[PDB]
């Protein structure tokens, strides 16, 4: 097949599937257990219980298959056909389909534009309804109760038909002429204004015309025949021991059959109305509970307060079918176990237990044993591997050799949660994991468990070596930084090596080379921290890419000379002359990769680990109770602050200070005293070690163990030390957030009961926040992947200069992130010129790798227009150019790489490191750095004082330093005090900004969820719509009035505002579009409409990056940009162009409008529509994909009435049917296959 379609089921098409009619609600005999005739399990209707065997047993073999034994009417075939054979029940009275009635957009409801309540009333047999009135006192549709209908029949015995119940609704749907009605609503939309005439009309017309397009008929809303599910789909299989196990579907079907049969019997029995109406309602209830139970009454299974699961419940939800079965399954050839360290492994291998290897590779072992004549047949090899014969072990070695296996950590936040390794057979039942990869998995050896998967096909074995290999993925996709970095013991050993202390044994001597340094230490003659200077030969390739070695003597240590032996050839040895902790083991690795490449860097990291582990081992590096040295001053400092609070106590007891004043006073003084104590111990630690240089005292950085661990970055930081050896600050409640009685004690002295109890308060919120956040972060990342999947790199180049302007984030005094980091890896939109205008620093469009970044960094440049994903001339995907570069590999992004999923992962993985609540704590401007004042967009004037004053609300304060870059950005309100002006020269901090004080979310992870959902803020700010002086309204009627006053042409626009909302805009001043008349938090829709696509795509990224910047999280703006692009994919036309208020996809509007604009015809104008992630994901071409993610019932119902069609054109729908996803390798295959199709 190549597509899937969904449409209404006509009664005849329903009977088509059925192979028999169910007449009796019986399942099996109760003594023979055989399927009764016409029962739900009937072998005549569906098929035989046993394979190739007849129920009566007369026909038994493959000799005769196609025959229907006259004995029992059974045809001998494969029993699995009971999985595919459907049936049908003939409903005595019509019964409506619940989905077409109870779903939010009631099909029958606005199909006849009748209200839902009245249809529900008619179905309960509580009133009548007219149909096909013709020439009647009444309409064609109406409602009347018992007395009303009583005397109504005598008026017109004919030409007046009024039914009651489901038959009435069906007949109303049948004689209904859709074209006739439709052909009127059109005009009702044209002449009459007053959108109430346009609220449901513009949607009802859509429903009508789509109903006609699908070809299905409305009368099929009411089910005439009820289809049944095959028996094997709802088995009664014996549960052993003894008791049987059935499906609730069986109970529901039994009820339906009982009620239909009783209705038939009563019909023949000629019973009065009340009885038969109660029976009709019972039948409707049973049918609706069988289809979608819970919408009406939640029928229950016997012997339980638990409701019986219906059909619809077996599809929707995280449990059920779609999420739990089709998108994810339990898989063969897999295992699980506890992971542990083996450092002896290479980065590309991992230790795998032999017991697990035997079971996993069982088929391979069987085949290999049978190949070499070691086993006669397959059974013999089975028995051999079962017997644990020695000969098989070698065979195992043969089959595991060069066969990658996928290792997976239980939680999978990003793609690095799964990586392939080369199996290394080991004894025991524990799995050995490589340390360098633990950072990628986010896995400790505290008992965590990991799973293993064995690739089956040759293609999977290649994908586990070229794509998912441990060595082919080093640097993260979210940010260029490498995720493979020495963690705790490696950096500690390296920091111990590179450390230096004066007067070490042999200090100042000279050595021939590093080999002699090693020979000197290992012999006990020279130490490892001596300040010795030796000769080293460093390699530098220069001037044509030709390696040239360099020999010289340097100022170094013995340990650094020993460490130089591991460094690859191409590095400069300036990387090895420092303290050598973790933070720049990272940068050493990064530079090694971006200079020498992948192959040298892999073995470089392996050697770093191999050496650091052994050196940290032989260094000792222990921790004792004396290692934590408390400052002797601490006593006095604590006593001083403790006394300081007594003055405040006397202050409040009198009334000189309020309660809040005194509380803030006490808290401030205690915080300052804590600062003092921590500073005392830190000054006694960092410079603690003092020894004699050449025979005389001198103080140097300390060798204290815990302090070395802090300084190297291997483990706990300074905040840990402050509590280890000093007063551990003051705690915080769940809210109230700080207590006045701090913790005087440090962990070493020991806590008393009260302070420990106080600490548990803050301890709980910390523990609890992690647990419940785990649930919500999954939801966030899941919505993210849902809104992004089908977006794949599909084109080489789009050919647009649009891009976005990349400028450094210079907030306040200094920069939060330089421009190199926000530009590197991307492509220029237009030729950057040297600061001297009209030149060329970079061509039109090129990938800016580190070299262009350095070139830009040297020249004075903080202005680079970078092409972005949001603005791109590509349809149904993104082109490699505008997206830019990124991967574990640092080249331009490949084609066919699905970037939406990896971006959702890049945003979801850090989502677990965020928090649920923020609870922040914390006026002329002072410029810090020497430079030149540069004002931006300011109108000013001179007054009495003679200096300059600002007349405009918006006024940016930049600084053009001696270089020409802008490191200062400050906003100054209306009526400031300008000391210099625009383009002046400031001293080292001259104050040029002065004004007056007055004239007069959560946030965190929930915040990120709010920004990606485009949720309206609590008290929104409103925005001006066009330039011009503002104008006021009539008076305060309800809220207030505000009249827009455009300057030149069309000036009728208007709006209404509450007088309770304060105002900020100037009265008689010109104010351009997108200005803040009112202070407040802005909304994405308003920014998009009043500023443009790029302004809003910059606002989203800049705001969602603050919460991730608060926490130590770094992700390139590219993924957030792709998400933002996916959000605004919808738009609404204005002028209706050449062909048909509507909302459609932007790409389709372009394919329809720009191609015709070329054809010289009229252009169509659209309006960007901004949607949240979940809302943008709600709208998708593929109905299968949408029905999988959320709201299965509604999506399926709507796609059913629409007769919509799905060619699957995408990822999720392809995994649902188990096909090659259209990306990566799947992209390469689909390209060739689709090229030959439809052409």
């Amino acid at each position: 097949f190549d597509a899937i379609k969904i449409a209404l089921a006509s009664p005849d098409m329903i009977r088509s599937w059925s192979f028999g009619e169910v007449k009796k609600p019986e399942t099996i005999n109760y003594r023979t257990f055989k399927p009764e005739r016409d029962g739900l399990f009937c072998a005549r209707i569906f098929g035989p219980v046993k394979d190739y065997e007849c129920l009566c047993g007369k026909y038994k073999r493959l000799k005769h298959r196609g025959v229907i034994c006259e004995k029992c009417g059974v045809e001998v075939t494969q029993t699995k056909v009971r999985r595919e054979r459907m049936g049908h029940i003939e409903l005595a009275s019509p019964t409506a389909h619940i989905w077409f009635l109870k779903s939010l957009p009631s099909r029958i409801g606005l199909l006849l534009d009748m209200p839902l309540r009245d249809i529900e009333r008619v179905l309960y047999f509580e009133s009548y309804v007219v149909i096909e009135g013709g020439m009647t006192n009444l309409e064609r549709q109406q409602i009347l109760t018992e007395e009303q209908y009583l005397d109504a029949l005598e008026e017109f015995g004919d030409e007046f038909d009024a039914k009651m119940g489901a038959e009435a609704i069906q007949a109303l749907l049948k004689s209904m002429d859709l074209e006739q009605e439709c052909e009127q609503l059109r005009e009702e939309l044209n002449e009459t204004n007053s959108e109430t005439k346009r609220k449901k009309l513009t949607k009802r017309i859509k429903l009508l015309e789509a109903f006609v397009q699908s070809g299905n008929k409305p009368e099929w809303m009411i089910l005439t025949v009820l289809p049944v599910l095959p028996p094997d789909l709802r088995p009664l299989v014996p549960l052993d021991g003894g008791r049987f196990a059935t499906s609730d579907l069986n109970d529901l079907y039994r009820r339906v059959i009982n009620r239909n049969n009783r209705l038939k019997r009563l019909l023949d029995l000629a019973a009065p109305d009340i009885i038969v109406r109660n029976e009709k309602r019972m039948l409707q209830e049973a049918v609706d509970a069988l289809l979608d139970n819970g919408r009406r009454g939640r029928a229950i299974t016997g012997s339980n307060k638990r409701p019986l699961k219906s059909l619809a419940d077996m599809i929707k939800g995280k449990q059920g079918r779609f999420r739990q079965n089709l998108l994810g399954k339990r898989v063969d050839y897999s295992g699980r176990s506890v992971i542990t360290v083996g450092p002896y492994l290479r980065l590309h291998q991992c230790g795998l237990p032999k017991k697990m290897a035997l079971e996993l590779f069982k088929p391979f072992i069987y085949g290999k044993l049978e190949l070499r004549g070691l086993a006669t047949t397959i059974k013999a090899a089975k028995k051999m591997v079962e017997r644990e014969e020695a000969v098989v072990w070698d065979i195992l070695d043969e089959v595991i050799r060069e066969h990658p296996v996928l290792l997976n950590r239980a939680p999978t936040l990003h793609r690095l949660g799964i990586q392939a390794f080369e199996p290394v057979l080991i004894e025991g039942k524990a799995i050995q994991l490589h340390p360098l990869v633990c950072a990628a998995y986010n896995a400790d050896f505290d008992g965590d468990q990991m799973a293993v998967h064995v690739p089956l096909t040759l293609e999977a074995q290649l994908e586990a070596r070229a794509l998912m290999m441990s060595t082919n993925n080093i640097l993260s996709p979210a940010n260029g930084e490498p995720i493979i970095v020495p963690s705790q013991d490696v950096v500690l050993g390296l920091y111990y090596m590179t450390r230096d202390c004066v007067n070490a044994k042999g200090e100042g001597m000279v050595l021939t080379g590093p080999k002699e340094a090693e020979r000197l230490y290992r012999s006990g003659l020279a130490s490892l921290h001596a300040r010795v200077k030796v000769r080293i030969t460093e390699y530098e390739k220069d001037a044509n890419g030709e390696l040239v070695a360099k020999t010289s003597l340097k100022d170094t240590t013995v340990g650094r000379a020993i460490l130089w032996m591991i460094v690859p050839k191409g590095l400069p040895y300036s990387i090895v002359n420092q303290a050598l902790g973790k933070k720049a083991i990272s940068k050493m690795l990064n530079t090694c990769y971006r200079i020498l490449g992948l192959k040298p860097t892999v073995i470089f990291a392996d050697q770093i680990m191999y050496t650091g582990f052994a050196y940290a081992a032989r260094s000792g590096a222990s921790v004792g109770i004396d290692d934590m040295v408390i400052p002797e001053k601490k006593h006095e400092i604590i006593s001083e602050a403790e006394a300081e609070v007594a003055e405040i106590q006397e202050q409040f007891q009198s009334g000189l200070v309020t309660a809040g004043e005194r509380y803030n006073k006490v808290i401030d003084i205690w915080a300052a005293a804590n600062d003092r104590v921590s500073k005392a111990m830190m000054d006694n630690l960092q410079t603690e070690t003092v020894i004699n240089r050449d025979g005389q005292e001198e103080k140097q950085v300390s060798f204290n163990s815990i302090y070395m661990m802090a300084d190297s970055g291997a483990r706990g930081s300074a905040a840990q030390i402050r509590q280890l050896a000093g007063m551990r600050g003051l705690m915080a409640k769940p809210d109230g957030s700080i207590i006045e009685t701090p913790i005087t004690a440090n962990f070493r002295e020991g806590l008393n009961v009260l302070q420990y109890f106080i600490s548990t308060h803050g301890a709980r919120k910390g523990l609890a926040d992690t647990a419940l956040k785990t649930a919500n972060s999954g939801y966030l990342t899941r919505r993210l992947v849902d809104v992004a999947q089908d977006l794949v790199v599909t084109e080489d180049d789009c050919g647009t200069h649009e891009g976005i302007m990349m400028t450094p984030v210079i907030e306040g005094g200094d920069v939060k992130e330089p421009l190199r980091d926000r530009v590197l890896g991307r492509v220029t939109a237009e030729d950057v010129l040297k600061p001297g205008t009209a030149d060329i620093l970079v061509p039109r469009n090129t990938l800016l790798h580190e070299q262009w970044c350095d070139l830009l960094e040297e020249n004075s440049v903080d202005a680079v227009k970078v092409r972005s994903v949001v603005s791109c001339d590509t349809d149904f995907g993104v082109c490699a150019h505008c997206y830019g570069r990124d991967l574990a590999r640092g080249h331009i992004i490949n084609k066919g790489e699905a970037i939406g999923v990896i971006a959702a992962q890049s945003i979801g993985e850090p989502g677990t490191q965020l928090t649920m609540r923020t609870f922040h704590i914390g006026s002329s401007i002072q410029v810090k750095n020497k430079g030149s004042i540069k004002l931006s967009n300011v109108k000013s004037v001179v007054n009495s004082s003679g200096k300059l004053v600002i007349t405009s609300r918006n006024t940016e304060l930049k600084l053009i330093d001696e270089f020409g870059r802008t490191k200062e950005s400050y906003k100054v309100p209306y009526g400031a005090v300008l000391a210099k002006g625009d383009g002046e020269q400031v001293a080292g901090g001259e104050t040029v900004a002065n004004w007056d004080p007055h004239t007069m979310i959560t946030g965190g992870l929930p915040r990120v969820a709010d920004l990606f959902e485009a949720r309206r803020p609590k008290e929104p700010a409103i925005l001006a719509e066009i330039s011009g002086i503002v104008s006021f309204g009539k008076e305060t009627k309800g809220k207030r009035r505000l009249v827009i006053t455009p300057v030149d042409g069309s000036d009728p626009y208007e709006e209404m505002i509450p007088k309770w909302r304060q105002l900020n805009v100037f009265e008689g001043e010109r104010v351009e579009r997108g200005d803040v008349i009112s202070d407040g938090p802005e909304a994405p829709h308003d920014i998009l409409r009043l500023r443009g696509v790029h302004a809003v795509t910059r606002y989203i990224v800049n705001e969602v990056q603050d919460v991730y910047r608060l926490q130590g999280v770094k992700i390139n703006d590219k993924h957030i940009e792709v998400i933002v692009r996916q959000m605004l994919r919808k738009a609404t036309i204005v002028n209706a162009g050449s062909s048909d208020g509507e909302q459609v996809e932007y790409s389709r509007v372009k394919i329809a409008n720009r191609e015709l604009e070329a054809n010289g015809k009229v252009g169509a104008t659209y309006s960007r529509d901004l949607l949240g992630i979940t809302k943008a994901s709600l709208a998708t071409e593929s109905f299968i994909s949408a029905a999988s993610f959320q709201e299965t019932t509604r999506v399926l119902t709507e796609a059913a009435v629409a007769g919509k069609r799905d060619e699957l054109r995408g990822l999720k729908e392809n995994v649902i049917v188990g096909r090659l996803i259209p990306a990566g390798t799947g992209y390469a295959y689909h390209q060739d296959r689709m090229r030959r199709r439809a052409a």
Binding site: N674, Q723, G729, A732, F919
Partner: peptide
């Protein structure tokens, strides 16, 4: 310095003060 949240550092409460 980083929402922890057990003790404050500069702007918010933190896991380590």
């Amino acid at each position: 310095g980083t929402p922890g949240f057990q003790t404050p550092d500069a702007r918010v409460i933190s896991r380590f003060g």
